[PDB]
Each structure stands twice: as C-alpha cells, then as structure tokens.
C-alpha cells in the first residue's frame, strides 16, 4: 500500500521496505561538474528494431509498455555493461506542473517527465533473477522538456483513455521505442536502485544527457490517468516521482566530455 500521497509517499516507504535508505538508492542529482569524464567507456549500443510491444498496462503507480522478452529482440550493450541486457518494460514518471516530474535532476534541475526504459541482464535468464543481483538490471533514463512534441509519442497519448484506471490493460503491439530516443546517446552512469519498492540495488544507471521535447498537450493527457481503480474516488495520476537520494560512496561517470 505504499503510493506518492502524503499518507504513504516516498518518506514512509523505508517503514516497509528498510533499503530505502540503503547505499546505493536511486534517483540522484548529476552534479555535472563533479561528474568525471570516463575514456574507457564505450559508446552505447541501443538494438531495438527487432523489439515486439504487446500491451499497455496502467499499474496504479504509472503506466508500462511491456514487451516480449523471450528473445533477444531488443537489447541494450556497450557503456559500461558487461554482457547483453533486454528490453522488458518502459514507464514514465511525471510532475503535476511542468517544473518538476523527474527522478534524476542535473544541477538540482528538474524536468517535466522522466522515461526508464528497463532492461534485464540475460545472464540471469529471467528479470526475477536479475533483480536480485548487483548488475542485473540497466535502466536507459531520459529527461523530457516541455516543448515542441515528440511525433513518437502520440500512440502512446491517444491509448491512456483506454487504460485511465488501476488495473487496465490495452493491445499496444507494433511501437517503435526508437521514436523515443533524442539524438545523441551520450549519458552519464552511476550504481544504483529501483526507483519504487522494492527499491532493490540491482540497477547500471544510464541516464542520457539530452533531453526529448513533448508538447503541453502530450503530458497533459498523462496527467488525467488515475492513480484509483475504477469506480473508486478520483485521484489523478500525477506527482509519481522519488525525489534525490543521497549519493554516498558513489561516483558519477560521463561518456563525454
Ligand atoms: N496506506 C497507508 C498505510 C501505509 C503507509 C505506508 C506504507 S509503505 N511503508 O509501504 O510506504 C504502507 C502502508
Ligand atoms: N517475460 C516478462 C514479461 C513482462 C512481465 C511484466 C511486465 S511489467 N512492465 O508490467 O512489469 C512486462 C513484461
Ligand atoms: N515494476 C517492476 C520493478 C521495477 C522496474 C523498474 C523500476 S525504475 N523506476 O527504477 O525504472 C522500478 C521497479
Ligand atoms: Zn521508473
């Protein structure tokens, strides 16, 4: 029953779930000055023109497109990674106003949204697995402005009517994830978590420098989902974002100088 009310909000989550303030949590603020600039990492490898979408679900705490991740159909390589990483689910989290939403922030800046394309190391066969290690998981994060609309964006707009409470699902095959990518894949990486409970320490961060730009109008209608189940008091869908989390004994890698 944990949530992002004033009742049961990111500050009560440690009550069930001790690791919130553990050593390695996330989200983080970048502190780009402090960030060091890593020669040894590799450009990343982003392979998604084989992905398969198959369905959208609104889970009470954010929407998900899932997909088959049965085969290595769309995978995430190089960076920092060690091995092959797949695509199961992306997700959003996002602000009741345009000047905050995000999880990560850059020199304290927050952005309107934020969207984690989450993927599973497949050295550990299934993504229960690999959330129970240290490197199983690498979350793709990037930052989305307000702005001009992101034409990738719209199929995903025009079916939230459809999934707008707790526990709908709709048919979301054939979306193209690469339509959700800005330009360039240069990012910054650190160690960290997941951000919602379980909050298990399990995630290669890969949060990308350049932002996407949506239109007022696209994030708008993420804000008239529902955080309620059907036919429950109205709650909108809105301000699902943890807030920084101390850094510890972490560094911040750049690919870019
Ligand atoms: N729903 C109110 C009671 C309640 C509040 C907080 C949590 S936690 N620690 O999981 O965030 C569970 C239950
Ligand atoms: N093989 C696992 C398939 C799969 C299971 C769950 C989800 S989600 N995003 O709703 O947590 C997506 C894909
Ligand atoms: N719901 C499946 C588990 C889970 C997957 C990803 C994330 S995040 N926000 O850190 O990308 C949290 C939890
Ligand atoms: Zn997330």
Not at 25 to 53: E, F, G, N
Not at 141 to 168: C, E, H, R, W, Y
Not at 194 to 205: D, G, S
Not at 208 to 220: D, N
């Amino acid at each position: 029953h944990w949530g992002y009310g004033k009742h049961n909000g990111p500050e009560h989550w440690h009550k069930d779930f001790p690791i919130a303030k553990g050593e390695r949590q996330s989200p983080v603020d970048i502190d780009t000055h402090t960030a060091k600039y890593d020669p040894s990492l590799k450009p990343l490898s982003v392979s998604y023109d084989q992905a398969t979408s198959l369905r959208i679900l609104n889970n009470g705490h954010a929407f998900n497109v899932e997909f088959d991740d049965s085969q290595d159909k769309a995978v995430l390589k190089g960076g920092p990674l060690d091995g092959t990483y797949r695509l199961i689910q992306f997700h959003f989290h996002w602000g009741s106003l345009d000047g905050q939403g995000s999880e990560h922030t850059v020199d304290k800046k927050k952005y309107a949204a934020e969207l984690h394309l989450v993927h599973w190391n497949t050295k550990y066969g299934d993504f229960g697995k690999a959330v129970q290690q240290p490197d199983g998981l690498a979350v793709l994060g990037i930052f989305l402005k307000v702005g001009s609309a992101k034409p990738g964006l719209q199929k995903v707009v025009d079916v939230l009517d459809s999934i707008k409470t707790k526990g709908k699902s709709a048919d979301f095959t054939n979306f193209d994830p690469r339509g959700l990518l800005p330009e360039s894949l240069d990012y910054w990486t650190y160690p960290g978590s997941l951000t919602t409970p379980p909050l298990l320490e399990c995630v290669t961060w890969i949060v990308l420098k350049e932002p996407i730009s949506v239109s007022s109008e696209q994030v708008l209608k993420f804000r008239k989902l529902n955080f309620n189940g059907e036919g429950e008091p109205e709650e909108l869908m809105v301000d699902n974002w943890r807030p920084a989390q101390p850094l510890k004994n972490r560094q911040i890698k750049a690919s870019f100088k």
